Design a protein around this ligand. Sequence first.
Ligand SMILES: Nc1ccn([C@H]2C[C@H](O)[C@@H](COP(=O)(O)OP(=O)(O)OP(=O)(O)O)O2)c(=O)n1
Ligand SMILES: [Ca+2]
Ligand SMILES: [Ca+2]
Ligand SMILES: [Ca+2]
Ligand SMILES: [Ca+2]
Ligand SMILES: [Ca+2]
Length: 903
Amino acid sequence: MKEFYLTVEQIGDSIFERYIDSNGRERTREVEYKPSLFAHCPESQATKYFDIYGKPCTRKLFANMRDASQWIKRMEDIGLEALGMDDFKLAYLSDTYNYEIKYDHTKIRVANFDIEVTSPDGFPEPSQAKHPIDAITHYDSIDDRFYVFDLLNSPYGNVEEWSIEIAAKLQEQGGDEVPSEIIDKIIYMPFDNEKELLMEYLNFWQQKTPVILTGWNVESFAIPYVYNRIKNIFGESTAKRLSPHRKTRVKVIENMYGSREIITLFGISVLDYIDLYKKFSFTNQPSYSLDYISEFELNVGKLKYDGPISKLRESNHQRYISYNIIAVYRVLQIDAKRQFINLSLDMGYYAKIQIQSVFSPIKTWDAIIFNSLKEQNKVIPQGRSHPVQPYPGAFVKEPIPNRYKYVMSFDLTSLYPSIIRQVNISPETIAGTFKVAPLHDYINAVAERPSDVYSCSPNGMMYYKDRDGVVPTEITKVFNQRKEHKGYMLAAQRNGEIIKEALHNPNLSVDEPLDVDYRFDFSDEIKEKIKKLSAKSLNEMLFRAQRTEVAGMTAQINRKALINGLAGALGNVWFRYYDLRNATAITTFGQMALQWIERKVNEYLNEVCGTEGEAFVLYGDTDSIYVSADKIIDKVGESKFRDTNHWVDFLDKFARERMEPAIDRGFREMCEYMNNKQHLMFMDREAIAGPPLGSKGIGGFWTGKKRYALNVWDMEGTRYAEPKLKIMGLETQKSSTPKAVQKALKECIRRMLQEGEESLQEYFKEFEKEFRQLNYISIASVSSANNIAKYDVGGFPGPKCPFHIRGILTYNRAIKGNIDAPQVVEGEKVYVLPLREGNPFGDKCIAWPSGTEITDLIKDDVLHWMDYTVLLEKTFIKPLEGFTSAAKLDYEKKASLFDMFDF
DNA sequence: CATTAAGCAGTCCGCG
DNA sequence: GCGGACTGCTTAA
Ligand SMILES: Nc1ccn([C@H]2C[C@H](O)[C@@H](COP(=O)(O)OP(=O)(O)OP(=O)(O)O)O2)c(=O)n1
Ligand SMILES: [Ca+2]
Ligand SMILES: [Ca+2]
Ligand SMILES: [Ca+2]
Ligand SMILES: [Ca+2]
Ligand SMILES: [Ca+2]
């Protein structure tokens, strides 16, 4: 097999590398790496090295990495560019692995762990580590085993061994319900004292040294706690045994009333699953507790126990250990679904970076571009300092706030990367400039053609047409990868709807799920067999189709985020290829493209409808347009349609056969206008929206920019079994909105769009009447808690104190002196409730850590003093008023002359 | 070591 | 009692 790296570090003049050899064995080596950098030389000097602009360079080979670094400083002082890769471990990886890395994940040790620490005096701070570590569960991906380290004797209580037999039993029979499929994979190790537990854990660690280290909050809790605890008991150099190279770096962050730290373990790549989830999931959650995320991702119930966590070990050690084990398994279950570790490995090896560098689009692209240029013997430019400077982005049309009955949307494929490729935007492809006209002159095709020689953007930039740029070249590679996975995702999505259709008439038989590949559209023969399957088989097939869709989503959406990241990186001062000429060449082209095609679509539809001057395009944002299809439906006549699916089919055909070719013609003309390298402005129909035929539903509405709702029947070629609400920007979509309120507002919208005014009024009336019965957490608002200290004046609110921050200070005063009440952590999220006048908290609101029950001592008073009237008005009534006024609809029946009668 | 556009909630201030 | 300027937060893209 081909060799591949596991980890790489620079430590002084040494590169320390862990890797897999040609026999598939894990190895380590220390290399006194000899780096090269480059300097511009005169043309007369023959050389094989040229910078990206074609200027000759001389190679400077250094005896060590420090010498190379000192030379960079001298060059800076002289005032001359020092070219080449200055991150030497990236150069080392590039020299060592001068081919496309093919990696085998089964050879990569992936460790998932978590620890328990009993603390009778508040949160056990990792930097102090003053309490015993009383449980560790460490899953090893190579052994496929959960290694469980259990402390039986502690200053906080002596306990009996954990029972695997009780652990497996149902909770309803007094067991812990540890999942049956991991029971045989548990290796249990009790210890009489913490010192022997910790010594054994370190010996184990040496035997099974993580390459990838993950888990839930391991970077901020588990790692620094273990490191500091071991340091306190055995000394710092024993703690350094957690690094395979015995080197660590301690990072102390001052928070005025916090003071915590992160430990860098050299030779390990830490991928905290919380950070992976936040980067790759495209969610914004009201809480990041493992309970909440597991419930969201897996539909599993909360891990229930009686009393505080500080008393759980002494009162129920059995459950304490089982829950430590289950918590580790839950992360593995989330990853089996989301596949973020897989993604990280794919991206890291593709770029040739430390795996943890996948968090950084700048580092990722720097490496990709460096490796690409190095293949051609090209030399990369020195990174330079740049002042931060705002620049313009995308265009968003102001919509007329209204109901919109029939809507079809159209969207440009991968817009910014497509613009890069179409125009040929790269640092080395710049050909010059032209004199700009106002943007509207390009939009309306009245401005002089910029160039008949070069490829242009309406920002004034010209690019060569006849040569390749490294940015377009490398962005295309990832774009093509992305395209493949999105195809798999959409096929799985379509396959899912086929299964949902068939679940309407399940067969009464004993059968099995069909062994199929969900990444490809089912054949007719498969569809025939599906229509004869049982409900059991269908529901299992749907699970597999959806899991396939999620895997496709992870792979495609994050490759999209990477390539969009490159367009954005051009606008970040720390990017080696930072250049606002290129960053704005993209955004300005985008603005032109959207507004050009708005004009073209309006022109085309007036033409085919036999009219003039009517506005068909009602809205657009960045790369999408929304077309009112009312006149298209009316031109045929609504009574001609047999059912909803009939008009949906009609509009689908209209978009594909008539509109899309006109859109294509429009964009090909624009490409010619700008004299672009290649036409890549591909705008396809996205959504088809409207009310069910014969209903009083309004179909859709806009309240303003980035705020709308649509009743969608078909999305990007997926014909839904049941209509799906597409809601953007409205409170239903916001993590700050109370859970039960999101639910109620969504039903209000559903009724508006699908059923009409009277249906809405009936729901509103019910919700208002039952509002006070909802669980307090379900009706609490949520906010992030930043700069708490700034507004903290002796426990009371300082000037301009935000509402949520005021709530936190109220809470802090209420829990003062109580050592067991959970503290609000700076930067994390809080539930927020308004409080009625005269409450014993002495302020208008309270806030507490999100994803938790408010502490028992103050919970009673919160429930008693909650201001339901304020809560309903602020979170529910006021947003609903926005929706209904825009839609020209009432959520409550207006008084009228008819009120004089007895109906 | 490291993208912009834009809506809504809330504070402060003005307001015979 | 509301608007206008301004901060904070959180979306859409
Ligand atoms: N983080 C982001 C998100 C978006 N955009 C810009 C670039 C995108 O090309 C454009 C439109 O984003 P979309 O969500 O419409 O997705 P794309 O057009 O990129 O991809 P596709 O439509 O193929 O999914 O907005 C950006 O610069 N940075
Ligand atoms: Ca725990
Ligand atoms: Ca599309
Ligand atoms: Ca798009
Ligand atoms: Ca059937
Ligand atoms: Ca879009």
